[PDB]
Amino acid sequence: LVYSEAGPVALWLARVRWLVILILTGMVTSSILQGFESVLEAVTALAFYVPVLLGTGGNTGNQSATLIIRALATRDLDLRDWRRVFLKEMGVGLLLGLTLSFLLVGKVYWDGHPLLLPVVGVSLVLIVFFANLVGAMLPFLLRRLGVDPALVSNPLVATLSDVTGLLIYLSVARLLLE
Amino acid sequence: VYSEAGPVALWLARVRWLVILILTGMVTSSILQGFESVLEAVTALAFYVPVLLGTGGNTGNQSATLIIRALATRDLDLRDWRRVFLKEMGVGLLLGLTLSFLLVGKVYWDGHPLLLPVVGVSLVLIVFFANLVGAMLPFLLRRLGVDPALVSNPLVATLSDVTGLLIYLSVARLLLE
Ligand SMILES: [Mn+2]
Ligand SMILES: [Mn+2]
Ligand SMILES: [Mn+2]
Ligand SMILES: [Mn+2]
């Protein structure tokens, strides 16, 4: 589609379907949170860190994904190299997790919620770790399924990290505060 | 190149950008803290935070993708940003009303009637503003000589999380308190 020649109505028609699919899939997060209503009610400040946790996961995943998409498209990597990449990214994700978690724990202490220092600290490490792997592996999976990663990698990694991020954080919270 | 670098080298190359983003993203926790009153009154408010901020990010990044492409192929010039701004005003409102209709349905299903106008109004505003942010950012970056490929997407997502939260919680406080 040519942007400069497309009217508002035309742009809406070309954009809406992808957004509808994403928000329908995104509604899952609201159901997840409802299933943890007990823990959310128990500790008020638990909800304060959801956007930065899910957002950091998304940032990490889309960073590693972009690196992989480029590496494959430039033939620096091949589809057969996914295992060696996986093993290497386990280390990178762990190192990134520890670094970012160290900072966020500082914020939690600043905000004055010492009860949440362990749950937030552990959760972000796990979230960065898994989001980094999802980001590194998705371009391989997409390519093998016939669709190039460049077109749809961003919203997929963002949605998956949101779902998996909520599940990790709230589960860690339920085990440590109950 | 990727096949070259080891784990520490990759960590070295990635950490600075992620640190800047999280230091920026930390503001969201401070924003939510400032609305603790209404959050405590209606706990269900927290249920729709990720889907609201996430839809804003999706909208913004979809918009940014189109603009980056048009600038690369010279379908648009740098000075066209005002005309793009005015047109995207309409597109965002149309996408906002469409997506809002769906999410209100989810709220109606979940059984939180108090949040029907809160979530409905917020999503329209969130989509509307996130769309403009996504459309304008490539103009700003190219003006500063920055390549969007590894910068545009995390920036839109973080800006939308902050602005989206400010909209949602302000509407919540207004309608519930
Ligand atoms: Mn309850
Ligand atoms: Mn409570
Ligand atoms: Mn507090
Ligand atoms: Mn996000």
UniProtKB/Swiss-Prot annotation, chain A:
One of its GO terms (molecular function) is protein homodimerization activity. Keywords: Calcium, CBS domain, Cell inner membrane, Cell membrane, Magnesium, Manganese, Membrane, Metal-binding, Repeat, Transmembrane, Transmembrane helix, Transport. Mn(2+) 1 binds at E5, E41. It is found in: Cell inner membrane. Changing E41A: Does not affect Mg(2+) transport, but increases permeability for Mn(2+) and Ca(2+). Changing E89A: Abolishes Mg(2+)-transport activity. It comes from the Bacteria. Changing P51A: Abolishes Mg(2+)-transport activity. The keyword Magnesium applies. Signal peptide: none annotated. Highly selective magnesium channel that plays an important role in Mg(2+) homeostasis. Functions as a Mg(2+)-dependent gating channel. Exhibits low activity with cobalt, suggesting that it might also be involved in the uptake of Co(2+) as a micronutrient. Also exhibits low activity with Ca(2+), but it shows almost no activity with Mn(2+). This is Magnesium transporter MgtE. It comes from Thermus thermophilus (strain ATCC 27634 / DSM 579 / HB8). The gene is mgtE.
